[PDB]
Coordinates of C-alpha atoms and ligand atoms in Angstrom, one line a residue:
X1 CA 4.4 -26.9 7.3
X2 CA 1.2 -25.2 8.3
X3 CA 0.9 -21.4 7.9
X4 CA -1.0 -21.3 11.2
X5 CA -2.0 -23.5 14.1
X6 CA -5.0 -22.5 16.2
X7 CA -6.1 -23.2 19.8
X8 CA -9.8 -22.3 19.3
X9 CA -9.5 -19.1 21.3
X10 CA -11.4 -16.3 19.5
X11 CA -9.8 -13.3 17.8
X12 CA -11.3 -10.5 19.8
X13 CA -11.9 -6.8 19.3
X14 CA -10.3 -4.2 21.5
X15 CA -13.2 -1.8 21.1
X16 CA -16.7 -1.2 19.7
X17 CA -17.0 -2.4 16.1
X18 CA -19.4 -1.0 13.5
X19 CA -20.3 -3.0 10.3
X20 CA -23.2 -0.9 9.0
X21 CA -22.6 2.5 7.2
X22 CA -23.1 5.3 9.7
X23 CA -25.4 8.0 8.3
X24 CA -25.5 11.7 9.0
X25 CA -27.0 14.8 7.3
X26 CA -24.3 14.8 4.6
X27 CA -24.5 11.1 3.7
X28 CA -27.3 11.2 1.1
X29 CA -25.5 14.0 -0.9
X30 CA -22.6 11.6 -1.7
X31 CA -24.2 8.1 -1.6
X32 CA -27.8 6.8 -1.4
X33 CA -27.4 3.0 -1.5
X34 CA -26.3 2.7 2.1
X35 CA -26.8 -1.1 2.4
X36 CA -24.0 -1.7 -0.1
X37 CA -21.3 -0.2 2.1
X38 CA -20.0 -2.3 5.0
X39 CA -17.0 -2.5 7.3
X40 CA -15.3 -5.8 8.3
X41 CA -15.2 -6.8 11.9
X42 CA -13.8 -9.5 14.3
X43 CA -17.1 -11.4 13.8
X44 CA -15.7 -12.7 10.4
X45 CA -12.3 -13.5 11.8
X46 CA -13.1 -17.2 11.9
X47 CA -13.8 -17.2 8.2
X48 CA -10.5 -15.5 7.4
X49 CA -8.7 -18.0 9.7
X50 CA -9.8 -20.9 7.5
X51 CA -8.6 -19.1 4.3
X52 CA -5.1 -18.3 5.6
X53 CA -4.5 -21.7 7.1
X54 CA -2.8 -24.3 4.8
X55 CA 0.2 -26.5 4.3
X56 CA 3.1 -25.0 2.3
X57 CA 5.4 -27.1 0.2
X58 CA 8.5 -25.7 -1.5
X59 CA 10.7 -27.0 -4.3
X60 CA 13.8 -24.9 -5.0
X61 CA 15.7 -25.2 -8.3
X62 CA 18.8 -23.7 -9.8
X63 CA 17.0 -20.7 -11.3
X64 CA 15.9 -19.8 -7.7
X65 CA 19.5 -20.0 -6.3
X66 CA 21.0 -18.2 -9.4
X67 CA 18.7 -15.2 -8.9
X68 CA 19.3 -15.2 -5.1
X69 CA 23.1 -15.1 -5.6
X70 CA 22.6 -12.1 -7.9
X71 CA 20.4 -10.4 -5.4
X72 CA 22.9 -11.0 -2.6
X73 CA 25.8 -9.6 -4.8
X74 CA 23.8 -6.3 -5.1
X75 CA 22.9 -6.3 -1.4
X76 CA 26.6 -6.5 -0.6
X77 CA 27.1 -3.0 -2.0
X78 CA 24.6 -1.6 0.6
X79 CA 25.9 0.2 3.7
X80 CA 23.2 0.6 6.3
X81 CA 23.2 2.6 9.6
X82 CA 21.8 1.9 13.0
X83 CA 19.2 4.4 14.1
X84 CA 19.5 5.9 17.5
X85 CA 16.7 5.4 20.0
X86 CA 15.6 9.1 19.5
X87 CA 15.5 8.8 15.7
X88 CA 13.5 5.6 15.9
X89 CA 11.2 7.2 18.4
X90 CA 10.4 10.2 16.1
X91 CA 9.3 7.7 13.4
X92 CA 6.6 6.3 15.7
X93 CA 3.0 7.4 14.8
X94 CA 1.2 9.5 17.4
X95 CA -1.7 7.1 17.6
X96 CA 0.3 3.8 17.3
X97 CA -0.8 1.1 19.7
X98 CA 0.4 1.6 23.3
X99 CA 2.9 -0.7 25.0
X100 CA 1.8 -3.4 27.5
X101 CA 4.5 -2.1 29.8
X102 CA 3.0 1.2 30.9
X103 CA 3.7 3.7 28.2
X104 CA 2.2 4.7 24.8
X105 CA 3.1 6.3 21.5
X106 CA 3.1 10.0 22.8
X107 CA 5.6 8.9 25.5
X108 CA 7.9 7.4 22.9
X109 CA 7.7 10.5 20.7
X110 CA 8.5 12.8 23.7
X111 CA 11.5 10.6 24.6
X112 CA 10.0 10.0 28.1
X113 CA 12.5 8.2 30.4
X114 CA 10.0 5.4 31.1
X115 CA 9.6 4.6 27.4
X116 CA 13.3 5.1 26.6
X117 CA 14.3 2.8 29.5
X118 CA 12.1 0.0 28.4
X119 CA 13.2 0.3 24.8
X120 CA 16.9 0.1 25.8
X121 CA 16.0 -3.1 27.8
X122 CA 14.2 -4.6 24.8
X123 CA 17.3 -3.8 22.7
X124 CA 19.6 -5.3 25.2
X125 CA 17.4 -8.5 25.3
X126 CA 17.5 -8.7 21.5
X127 CA 21.3 -8.6 21.6
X128 CA 21.6 -11.2 24.4
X129 CA 18.8 -13.6 23.4
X130 CA 18.5 -15.0 19.8
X131 CA 16.0 -17.9 20.6
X132 CA 13.0 -16.9 22.6
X133 CA 9.9 -16.3 20.5
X134 CA 8.5 -12.8 20.8
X135 CA 4.8 -12.3 21.6
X136 CA 2.5 -10.9 19.0
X137 CA -1.1 -9.5 19.1
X138 CA -3.5 -10.8 16.5
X139 CA -6.4 -8.5 15.5
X140 CA -9.2 -8.2 13.0
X141 CA -8.8 -5.2 10.8
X142 CA -11.8 -2.9 10.4
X143 CA -11.9 -1.9 6.7
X144 CA -14.6 -0.5 4.5
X145 CA -15.9 -2.0 1.2
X146 CA -18.7 -2.2 -1.3
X147 CA -20.6 -5.5 -1.5
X148 CA -19.5 -8.0 -4.3
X149 CA -18.9 -9.7 1.9
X150 CA -15.2 -10.1 2.4
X151 CA -14.1 -11.5 5.8
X152 CA -11.8 -9.3 7.9
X153 CA -8.1 -9.2 7.1
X154 CA -5.9 -10.1 10.0
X155 CA -3.0 -8.0 11.5
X156 CA -0.2 -9.5 13.5
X157 CA 2.1 -7.2 15.4
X158 CA 4.5 -7.1 18.4
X159 CA 4.7 -4.7 21.3
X160 CA 5.5 -1.0 20.8
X161 CA 8.9 -1.5 22.5
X162 CA 9.9 -4.1 19.9
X163 CA 8.6 -1.9 17.1
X164 CA 10.9 0.9 18.1
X165 CA 13.8 -1.6 18.2
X166 CA 12.9 -2.8 14.6
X167 CA 13.3 0.7 13.4
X168 CA 16.7 1.0 15.1
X169 CA 18.0 -2.2 13.5
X170 CA 16.3 -2.2 10.1
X171 CA 14.7 1.2 9.1
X172 CA 17.7 2.2 7.0
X173 CA 18.0 -1.3 5.6
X174 CA 14.3 -1.6 4.4
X175 CA 14.5 2.0 3.1
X176 CA 17.7 1.6 0.9
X177 CA 18.3 -2.1 0.1
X178 CA 15.3 -3.0 -2.1
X179 CA 16.1 -0.3 -4.7
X180 CA 19.7 -1.4 -4.8
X181 CA 18.8 -5.1 -5.1
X182 CA 15.8 -4.8 -7.5
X183 CA 16.7 -1.6 -9.4
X184 CA 14.0 -0.2 -11.6
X185 CA 11.7 -3.2 -10.7
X186 CA 11.2 -1.8 -7.2
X187 CA 7.7 -0.3 -7.3
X188 CA 7.7 1.9 -4.2
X189 CA 10.4 4.3 -5.7
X190 CA 7.9 5.7 -8.2
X191 CA 5.3 8.4 -7.8
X192 CA 2.1 7.6 -9.8
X193 CA 3.3 9.7 -12.6
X194 CA 6.8 8.2 -12.6
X195 CA 5.2 4.8 -12.5
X196 CA 3.1 5.5 -15.6
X197 CA 6.2 6.9 -17.3
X198 CA 8.2 3.8 -16.5
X199 CA 5.4 1.5 -17.7
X200 CA 5.0 3.3 -21.0
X201 CA 8.7 3.5 -21.7
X202 CA 9.0 -0.2 -20.8
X203 CA 6.1 -1.1 -23.1
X204 CA 7.6 0.8 -26.0
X205 CA 11.1 -0.7 -25.4
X206 CA 9.7 -4.1 -26.6
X207 CA 9.3 -4.8 -30.3
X208 CA 6.2 -6.8 -29.8
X209 CA 5.1 -6.2 -26.2
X210 CA 3.2 -8.5 -24.0
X211 CA 2.3 -8.0 -20.3
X212 CA 0.6 -9.7 -17.4
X213 CA -0.3 -9.3 -13.7
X214 CA 0.3 -12.1 -11.3
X215 CA -1.7 -12.1 -8.1
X216 CA -0.7 -14.7 -5.4
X217 CA -3.4 -16.3 -3.3
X218 CA -3.0 -15.1 0.3
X219 CA 0.7 -14.2 -0.2
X220 CA 1.5 -13.7 3.5
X221 CA 0.5 -17.2 4.3
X222 CA 2.5 -18.6 1.4
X223 CA 5.7 -17.1 2.9
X224 CA 7.7 -20.0 4.5
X225 CA 10.4 -20.2 7.1
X226 CA 12.9 -20.7 4.3
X227 CA 11.7 -17.5 2.6
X228 CA 12.1 -15.5 5.8
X229 CA 15.6 -16.9 6.4
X230 CA 16.6 -16.2 2.8
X231 CA 15.4 -12.6 3.3
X232 CA 17.6 -12.4 6.4
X233 CA 20.6 -13.7 4.5
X234 CA 20.1 -10.8 2.0
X235 CA 19.9 -8.2 4.8
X236 CA 23.1 -9.6 6.3
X237 CA 25.0 -9.0 3.0
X238 CA 24.9 -5.3 3.9
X239 CA 27.7 -3.4 5.4
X240 CA 26.3 -3.2 9.0
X241 CA 27.3 -2.4 12.5
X242 CA 27.9 -5.6 14.5
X243 CA 25.1 -4.6 16.9
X244 CA 22.7 -4.3 13.9
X245 CA 23.7 -7.7 12.6
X246 CA 22.9 -9.4 15.9
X247 CA 19.5 -7.5 16.3
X248 CA 18.6 -8.6 12.8
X249 CA 19.5 -12.2 13.5
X250 CA 17.6 -12.0 16.8
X251 CA 14.5 -10.4 15.3
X252 CA 14.5 -12.9 12.5
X253 CA 14.7 -16.0 14.7
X254 CA 12.3 -14.7 17.4
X255 CA 9.8 -12.6 15.5
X256 CA 9.9 -12.7 11.7
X257 CA 10.0 -16.5 11.2
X258 CA 7.1 -17.1 13.5
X259 CA 5.7 -16.9 17.0
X260 CA 2.8 -17.2 19.4
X261 CA -0.4 -15.3 18.7
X262 CA -2.3 -13.6 21.5
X263 CA -5.7 -11.9 21.3
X264 CA -6.6 -8.5 22.8
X265 CA -7.9 -10.2 26.0
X266 CA -4.4 -11.8 26.5
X267 CA -5.5 -15.4 25.4
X268 CA -3.3 -17.7 23.3
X269 CA -4.9 -17.9 19.9
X270 CA -2.2 -20.2 18.4
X271 CA 1.0 -20.1 16.4
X272 CA 2.3 -18.4 13.2
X273 CA 4.8 -20.0 10.7
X274 CA 4.4 -17.4 8.0
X275 CA 4.7 -13.6 7.3
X276 CA 3.6 -11.3 10.1
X277 CA 1.5 -8.5 8.4
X278 CA 2.4 -5.9 11.1
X279 CA 6.1 -5.8 11.2
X280 CA 8.6 -3.3 9.8
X281 CA 10.0 -5.8 7.3
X282 CA 6.6 -6.9 5.9
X283 CA 6.7 -4.7 2.8
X284 CA 10.4 -5.1 2.1
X285 CA 10.4 -8.9 2.7
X286 CA 7.3 -9.5 0.6
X287 CA 8.8 -7.4 -2.2
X288 CA 12.1 -9.2 -2.1
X289 CA 10.5 -12.7 -1.9
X290 CA 8.0 -11.9 -4.7
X291 CA 10.8 -10.6 -6.9
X292 CA 13.0 -13.6 -6.2
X293 CA 10.3 -16.2 -7.0
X294 CA 9.0 -14.3 -10.0
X295 CA 12.5 -13.6 -11.5
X296 CA 13.3 -17.3 -11.2
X297 CA 10.0 -18.2 -12.7
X298 CA 10.6 -15.9 -15.7
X299 CA 13.8 -17.9 -16.4
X300 CA 12.0 -21.2 -16.1
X301 CA 9.3 -20.0 -18.5
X302 CA 12.0 -18.7 -20.9
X303 CA 10.3 -15.4 -21.2
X304 CA 12.3 -13.0 -23.4
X305 CA 13.5 -9.6 -22.3
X306 CA 11.5 -9.6 -19.1
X307 CA 11.0 -6.3 -17.3
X308 CA 9.4 -6.7 -13.8
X309 CA 7.5 -4.3 -11.6
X310 CA 7.0 -5.5 -8.0
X311 CA 5.6 -3.9 -4.8
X312 CA 4.8 -6.2 -1.9
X313 CA 2.9 -9.2 -3.2
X314 CA 1.8 -7.3 -6.4
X315 CA 3.6 -8.2 -9.5
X316 CA 3.6 -7.1 -13.2
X317 CA 5.8 -8.5 -15.9
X318 CA 6.3 -6.9 -19.3
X319 CA 8.3 -8.9 -21.9
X320 CA 8.8 -9.7 -25.6
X321 CA 5.9 -11.6 -27.1
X322 CA 6.6 -14.8 -28.8
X323 CA 3.1 -15.0 -30.3
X324 CA -0.4 -15.5 -28.7
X325 CA -0.3 -19.3 -28.3
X326 CA 3.4 -19.4 -27.2
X327 CA 2.8 -16.6 -24.6
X328 CA -0.2 -18.5 -23.2
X329 CA 1.9 -21.6 -22.8
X330 CA 4.8 -19.6 -21.2
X331 CA 2.5 -18.2 -18.5
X332 CA 1.3 -21.7 -17.6
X333 CA 5.0 -22.6 -17.1
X334 CA 5.6 -19.4 -15.1
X335 CA 2.6 -20.3 -12.9
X336 CA 3.8 -23.8 -12.4
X337 CA 7.2 -22.5 -11.3
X338 CA 5.7 -19.9 -8.9
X339 CA 3.5 -22.6 -7.4
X340 CA 6.5 -24.9 -6.8
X341 CA 8.0 -21.9 -5.0
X342 CA 4.9 -22.0 -2.8
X343 CA 3.1 -19.0 -4.5
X344 CA 0.1 -20.2 -6.6
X345 CA -2.1 -17.7 -8.2
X346 CA -5.6 -16.7 -6.9
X347 CA -6.7 -16.2 -10.5
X348 CA -4.6 -17.6 -13.5
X349 CA -2.5 -14.9 -15.2
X350 CA -3.6 -13.6 -18.7
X351 CA -1.4 -12.2 -21.3
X352 CA -2.3 -8.7 -22.5
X353 CA -1.3 -6.9 -25.7
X354 CA -2.5 -3.4 -24.6
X355 CA -0.8 -1.7 -21.6
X356 CA -4.2 -0.2 -20.4
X357 CA -5.8 -3.6 -20.1
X358 CA -3.2 -4.7 -17.4
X359 CA -4.7 -4.3 -13.9
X360 CA -2.6 -4.3 -10.8
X361 CA -3.2 -2.9 -7.3
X362 CA -6.8 -2.3 -8.6
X363 CA -5.3 0.2 -10.9
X364 CA -4.6 0.7 -14.6
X365 CA -3.0 3.1 -17.1
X366 CA -5.4 5.4 -18.9
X367 CA -5.3 8.3 -21.3
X368 CA -6.6 11.9 -21.1
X369 CA -5.7 15.2 -22.8
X370 CA -3.9 18.3 -21.5
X371 CA -4.8 21.9 -22.3
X372 CA -2.9 21.8 -25.6
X373 CA -4.8 18.6 -26.6
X374 CA -1.7 16.5 -26.1
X375 CA -2.2 12.9 -24.9
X376 CA -1.4 12.4 -21.2
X377 CA -1.1 9.0 -19.6
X378 CA -2.1 8.7 -16.0
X379 CA -2.9 6.1 -13.3
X380 CA -6.5 5.5 -12.5
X381 CA -8.5 2.8 -10.6
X382 CA -11.9 1.5 -10.0
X383 CA -13.5 4.1 -7.8
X384 CA -15.9 1.8 -6.0
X385 CA -13.8 1.3 -2.8
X386 CA -12.6 4.9 -2.6
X387 CA -16.2 6.1 -2.9
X388 CA -17.5 3.6 -0.3
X389 CA -14.7 4.8 2.1
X390 CA -15.5 8.4 1.4
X391 CA -19.1 7.7 2.4
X392 CA -18.0 6.2 5.8
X393 CA -15.6 9.1 6.4
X394 CA -18.4 11.5 5.6
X395 CA -20.3 10.4 8.8
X396 CA -17.3 9.2 10.9
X397 CA -13.9 10.4 11.9
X398 CA -11.4 7.7 11.1
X399 CA -7.7 7.2 11.9
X400 CA -6.8 7.2 8.3
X401 CA -8.4 9.7 5.9
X402 CA -8.6 7.6 2.7
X403 CA -10.3 10.4 0.8
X404 CA -7.2 12.6 1.3
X405 CA -4.8 9.9 0.3
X406 CA -6.9 9.1 -2.8
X407 CA -7.0 12.8 -3.8
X408 CA -3.3 13.0 -3.6
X409 CA -2.5 9.7 -5.4
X410 CA -5.3 9.8 -7.9
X411 CA -5.5 13.5 -8.5
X412 CA -5.5 13.4 -12.3
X413 CA -8.6 11.1 -12.3
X414 CA -12.1 12.2 -13.3
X415 CA -13.6 10.7 -10.1
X416 CA -11.0 12.2 -7.7
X417 CA -11.4 15.6 -9.1
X418 CA -15.1 15.8 -9.7
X419 CA -16.5 13.9 -6.7
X420 CA -13.8 13.5 -3.9
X421 CA -12.4 17.1 -4.1
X422 CA -15.8 18.7 -4.5
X423 CA -17.4 16.8 -1.6
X424 CA -14.7 17.0 1.0
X425 CA -13.7 20.7 0.3
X426 CA -17.4 21.5 0.8
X427 CA -17.4 19.7 4.2
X428 CA -14.1 21.4 5.2
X429 CA -15.4 24.8 4.2
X430 CA -18.6 24.4 6.3
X431 CA -16.6 23.5 9.4
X432 CA -13.8 26.0 8.7
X433 CA -11.3 23.1 8.9
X434 CA -9.3 23.8 5.8
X435 CA -6.1 24.5 7.9
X436 CA -6.6 21.4 10.1
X437 CA -3.9 18.8 9.5
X438 CA -5.2 15.3 8.8
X439 CA -3.6 11.9 9.0
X440 CA -3.3 9.9 5.8
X441 CA -1.3 7.0 4.3
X442 CA 1.2 7.1 1.4
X443 CA 2.6 3.7 0.5
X444 CA 1.8 2.4 4.0
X445 CA 3.5 5.3 5.7
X446 CA 1.5 7.8 7.8
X447 CA 1.7 11.5 7.0
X448 CA 0.0 14.5 8.6
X449 CA -1.2 16.8 5.8
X450 CA -3.0 20.1 5.5
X451 CA -5.8 20.1 2.8
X452 CA -4.8 23.7 2.0
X453 CA -1.4 22.3 0.7
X454 CA -3.1 20.0 -1.9
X455 CA -2.5 22.2 -5.0
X456 CA 1.3 22.4 -4.2
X457 CA 1.4 18.6 -3.4
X458 CA -0.5 17.8 -6.6
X459 CA 1.7 20.0 -8.9
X460 CA 4.8 18.4 -7.5
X461 CA 3.6 14.8 -7.8
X462 CA 1.6 14.9 -11.0
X463 CA 2.5 18.2 -12.7
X464 CA 0.3 21.2 -13.7
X465 CA -1.5 19.0 -16.3
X466 CA -3.4 17.4 -13.4
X467 CA -5.4 20.6 -13.1
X468 CA -6.4 20.7 -16.8
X469 CA -6.9 17.1 -18.0
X470 CA -9.9 16.6 -20.2
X471 CA -11.3 14.3 -22.9
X472 CA -11.1 11.2 -20.7
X473 CA -11.5 7.8 -22.4
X474 CA -15.0 6.4 -23.0
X475 CA -14.0 3.3 -21.1
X476 CA -12.9 5.3 -18.0
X477 CA -15.9 7.6 -18.2
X478 CA -18.3 4.6 -18.5
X479 CA -16.7 2.7 -15.6
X480 CA -17.1 5.8 -13.3
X481 CA -20.7 6.5 -14.5
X482 CA -21.6 2.9 -13.9
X483 CA -20.0 2.8 -10.4
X484 CA -22.0 6.0 -9.6
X485 CA -25.3 4.3 -10.5
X486 CA -24.4 1.2 -8.6
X487 CA -23.7 3.1 -5.4
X488 CA -26.5 5.6 -5.8
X489 CA -24.0 8.5 -6.1
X490 CA -25.3 11.6 -8.0
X491 CA -24.2 11.8 -11.7
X492 CA -21.1 13.8 -12.7
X493 CA -23.3 16.7 -14.0
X494 CA -24.5 17.4 -10.5
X495 CA -20.9 17.3 -9.2
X496 CA -19.9 19.9 -11.8
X497 CA -22.7 22.2 -10.5
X498 CA -21.6 21.6 -6.9
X499 CA -17.9 22.3 -7.8
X500 CA -18.8 25.7 -9.2
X501 CA -20.2 26.7 -5.8
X502 CA -17.3 25.1 -3.9
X503 CA -14.9 26.9 -6.1
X504 CA -16.6 30.3 -5.6
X505 CA -16.7 29.8 -1.8
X506 CA -13.0 28.9 -1.9
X507 CA -12.1 32.0 -3.9
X508 CA -14.0 34.2 -1.5
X509 CA -11.8 33.1 1.4
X510 CA -8.7 34.4 -0.4
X511 CA -5.1 33.2 0.2
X512 CA -4.3 29.5 0.2
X513 CA -8.0 28.7 0.1
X514 CA -8.3 30.8 -3.0
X515 CA -5.5 28.9 -4.6
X516 CA -7.3 25.6 -3.9
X517 CA -10.3 27.2 -5.6
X518 CA -8.2 28.3 -8.6
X519 CA -6.3 25.1 -9.4
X520 CA -8.4 22.2 -8.0
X521 CA -11.6 23.4 -9.6
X522 CA -10.5 25.0 -12.9
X523 CA -12.2 22.1 -14.7
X524 CA -15.5 23.3 -13.3
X525 CA -15.6 26.6 -15.2
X526 CA -16.3 27.4 -18.9
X527 CA -13.7 30.2 -19.3
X528 CA -10.6 28.5 -17.8
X529 CA -8.0 30.6 -15.8
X530 CA -4.3 30.7 -16.8
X531 CA -2.7 28.0 -14.5
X532 CA 1.0 28.7 -13.8
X533 CA 3.4 27.2 -11.2
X534 CA 2.7 27.9 -7.5
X535 CA 10.1 18.5 1.6
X536 CA 8.8 15.6 -0.4
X537 CA 12.0 13.6 -0.6
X538 CA 10.9 10.8 1.7
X539 CA 7.6 10.2 0.0
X540 CA 8.5 7.7 -2.7
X541 CA 11.6 5.9 -1.4
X542 CA 10.1 2.7 0.1
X543 CA 7.0 0.8 1.1
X544 CA 6.2 0.7 4.8
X545 CA 2.7 -1.0 4.9
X546 CA 2.1 -2.4 8.4
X547 CA 5.5 -1.0 9.4
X548 CA 4.3 1.6 12.0
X549 CA 6.0 4.5 10.2
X550 CA 5.2 8.2 10.5
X551 CA 6.4 11.4 9.0
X552 CA 5.8 15.2 9.1
Ligands
K4M601 C1 3.1 -4.0 -9.5 N1 2.1 -3.0 -9.5 C2 2.4 -1.7 -9.6 O1 3.5 -1.3 -9.8 C3 1.2 -0.8 -9.6 C4 0.2 -0.5 -10.7 C5 0.1 -1.0 -12.1 C6 1.3 -1.5 -12.7 C7 1.2 -2.0 -14.0 C8 0.0 -2.0 -14.7 F1 0.0 -2.4 -15.9 C9 -1.1 -1.4 -14.1 C10 -1.1 -0.9 -12.8 O2 -0.5 0.5 -10.1 C11 -0.2 0.8 -8.9 C12 -0.8 1.8 -8.1 C13 -0.3 2.0 -6.8 N2 -1.0 3.0 -6.1 N3 -1.2 4.2 -6.7 C14 -1.9 4.9 -5.7 N4 -2.0 4.1 -4.6 C15 -1.5 2.9 -4.9 C16 -1.4 1.8 -3.9 C17 -1.7 0.5 -4.1 C18 -1.5 -0.5 -3.1 C19 -1.0 -0.1 -1.8 B1 -0.8 -1.1 -0.7 O3 -1.9 -1.3 0.3 O4 0.7 -1.4 -0.3 C20 -0.7 1.2 -1.6 F2 -0.2 1.6 -0.4 C21 -0.9 2.2 -2.6 C22 0.8 1.3 -6.4 C23 1.3 1.6 -5.0 C24 2.8 1.2 -4.6 C25 1.6 0.4 -4.1 C26 1.4 0.3 -7.2 C27 0.9 0.1 -8.4

């Protein structure tokens, strides 16, 4: 079966698109090599269309069915509740795409009778009709990158009214079920620090550890009708209200398995027979499906004492080594199995015998030292993309503030602390916008966050050590330095000088601003201050990427 069928109608933009890096008076202070930063646009949609369009074949063996049975048995212990219209409404982001039927996100959030009425009618229709394909909009995402150009990723999503209904039927399910089914393997339950702790303990729990990342080629497109029905069969194992069961059956048949694709101008672009990137179940479904195929493939490959870590289409396995030559062979068998299950790799997996050499989600484990000189493990990543996005956000206001999310998630890193914090706090100071709440994304979910709360947020997430890490590894230092030269970003010494100023300015403001000065920029002074201790329950429960989820 073909992932997509196309009519030849173009994937069209809904507004003005910019590909070239906007430049203002601040731009040069961060980044000089402007021509290396670009944004994807609808102009490259055609290229993406070719990539995501292929035939899927699937061969399902006993290992696959064995694992599925196990997953279903765990899923049967889950009790999930229906959300009320109001509850689902409050989970809708302020700037979420408006409905075609005469109301928008703010109407939904305010429980306006027009919105509520339509939503009830969508719900009723879901309950009564289990067959009629539901319309979706196909759009080209506008995302920023550094050269070496990627074609635009595609987003497929249904009407606002349907999205509120998804929340009603499935929000509790997708929030609770994956952890129960996958246990410690479910990657969205961990903060970055907890993730590192899990990886380290896991690595040490093997006598002779080996590990690898496995990255599927165009995972969404590899998801078949079977996979999506199998996901549904798992959801349906839950203790559910009858109404919820029907809605989940309906949504699966009418939306999740496939449907017609319509562009922004209302033209039929074609038909989808794979994973929709812009539905509530996208994260949960990809994670379950990846876990299922990978667990089964582990058994086929006879890997010993396998510990898996899975989030969305991203997968890492740590296991007991059987020797270099044996391990290499086992991975080929793993890859063969995965491919038979419709999930071939983009790049072949490689066994690693050092935790820090394993790369996944563009990230790796690295080591620094705390104030006492004790070794502290932390999550870092290549800073190229974050820095390119920071440059764009320097000159343009964007819906998602990647710099803020990056500072939160990668707070312990040399690059987040020295460059991102220094730069954006300077900007915020100059505009007196420190108290202004900003939208950002945490594991696909949108939060509104005040920059002045960063120290508190960082302490809670990463610990107090995040503010005093030093003696970074030569490898990490060199990667950062190299990236800086590549992008024409000033060297770290300049940022140290700038941070001293930013710190001083912050301290002068007093209050919460002063605390930002104290904790965020303690690294910038010679004679360090004594750093002592200075809501977040929903933050690291589940993945909601593409799921249209918002929180306060
Ligand atoms: C199986 N992979 C892992 O569990 C991860 C390793 C990892 C694991 C093992 C290893 F050896 C090296 C790195 O490092 C990671 C870093 C992240 N972080 N950390 C900050 N931000 C992200 C991130 C990444 C992607 C997305 B996405 O668009 O859905 C997102 F929203 C946020 C995550 C986040 C849960 C997704 C997972 C892992």
